């Protein structure tokens, strides 16, 4: 049975830049680095990043809505937002910061887990939504 | 700060093949859907699908590395990827792993063990240029 995330890898034109654009961000964390990756954690999050000569970097326009989510408590958003503003990252759409990476993976900070945007849902519902359970 | 992964959204073509497809699998489980998207639980991992027309069937040939793993035990890896076989999940590479595609081509894969074991068996034989930052005694 599948208990979880086990980790994400994302694809990388350049070790060494990704590294430093992923070290900036406060709770991320490197374990280990070799000649076509790195292994960095954020939590329980295992991160991986994959040198791969096939990955283009891709403006956000020309890829689909496929991003990745990282917790940041609401206390700390707009800390962890003018940083990343600071540092130029670009953002690529509209309790959520939406920044891409080196590459151009789509990332977000929000604030908020499942259970309060389900509950949020139920006080107001999406077009055609059914709850199971 | 970031706590961590907060979740993870794939878009997807069909949003009712998508969900039979990941519902296939023991430990997901759906919450809500709707018009456009669903939401998904396993563990921890909130799996969000979101519906859109930009997106294409890729093949793995045509895309990148960039792929996402789920947890099983080692009691029970053997189980759940003759599950997926059975199935007809198509593979996307060759092989504690098994790497298939879901309907649009998303890379996943199942392994056992975790960030700490894959360090420890990296220490006992690094890849190439290999440079840990934990500090052990390693000889
Ligand atoms: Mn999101
Ligand atoms: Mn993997
Ligand atoms: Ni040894
Ligand atoms: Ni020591």
């Known amino acids: 049975m599948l208990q979880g995330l086990n980790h994400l890898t994302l694809a990388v034109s350049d070790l060494a ?4 654009f992923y070290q900036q961000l ?3 964390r490197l ?5 076509s990756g790195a292994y960095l954690s ?3 999050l295992w991160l991986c990043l994959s040198l791969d000569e096939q990955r283009r970097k891709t403006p956000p326009q020309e890829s689909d809505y ?3 989510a990282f917790s940041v408590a609401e206390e700390e958003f707009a800390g962890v937002v003018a940083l990343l503003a600071q540092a130029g990252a670009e953002v690529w759409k509209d ?4 920044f891409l990476d080196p590459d151009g993976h ?7 887990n499942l259970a309060q945007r389900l ?7 999406y077009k055609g939504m059914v709850f199971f359970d």
């Open 17 to 20: 830049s990704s590294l430093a």
């Open 42 to 44: 954020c939590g329980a």
């Open 66 to 68: 496929t991003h990745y």
């Open 31 to 35: 374990h280990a680095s070799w000649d």
């Open 26 to 28: 406060p709770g991320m």
């Open 95 to 98: 309790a959520s910061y939406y």
């Open 106 to 112: 789509k990332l977000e900070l929000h604030v908020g």
């Open 119 to 125: 509950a949020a849902c139920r006080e107001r519902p």
